[PDB]
Ligand binder design. Structure first.
Ligand SMILES: O=C1CC[C@@H](N2CCCc3ccccc32)C(=O)N1
Ligand SMILES: [Zn+2]
Length: 102
């Protein structure tokens, strides 16, 4: 009953409890905004915007790209790339997702 993560704003399919990567990081951006981030190995239904940036990266050795909900454009988090073990992952804002049945 709690296996799929969807965008809270529009219901787009985003990820699965199975795809969590151990999981929960509380971070601040330079504007002091707090994000409660869940790391996922895999996500779908996003639109990755721009080219990667290392600036203010929360994760040592990773560059980030903005991940929008590909349906409604709501900011769901970031895709991280350029690191090692693992090379890539997603950091999604927990309170911008909804959890429910398959
Ligand atoms: O690893 C990261 C990702 C985003 C980044 N960040 C910095 C750039 C400005 C900005 C604006 C809104 C949300 C986040 C944000 C961050 O501090 N670290
Ligand atoms: Zn959405």
């Amino acid at each position: 009953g709690a296996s799929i993560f969807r965008c809270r704003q529009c219901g787009q399919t985003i990820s699965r409890r199975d795809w969590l990567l151990p999981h929960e990081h509380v971070v601040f951006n330079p504007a002091g905004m707090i994000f409660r981030v869940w790391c996922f190995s895999l996500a779908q239904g996003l639109r990755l915007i721009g080219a990667p940036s290392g600036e203010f990266s929360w994760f040592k050795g990773y560059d980030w790209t903005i991940a929008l909900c590909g349906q409604c454009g709501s900011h769901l988090g970031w895709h991280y790339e350029g690191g090692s073990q693992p090379q890539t992952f997603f950091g999604l804002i927990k309170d911008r997702l909804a959890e429910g049945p398959a």
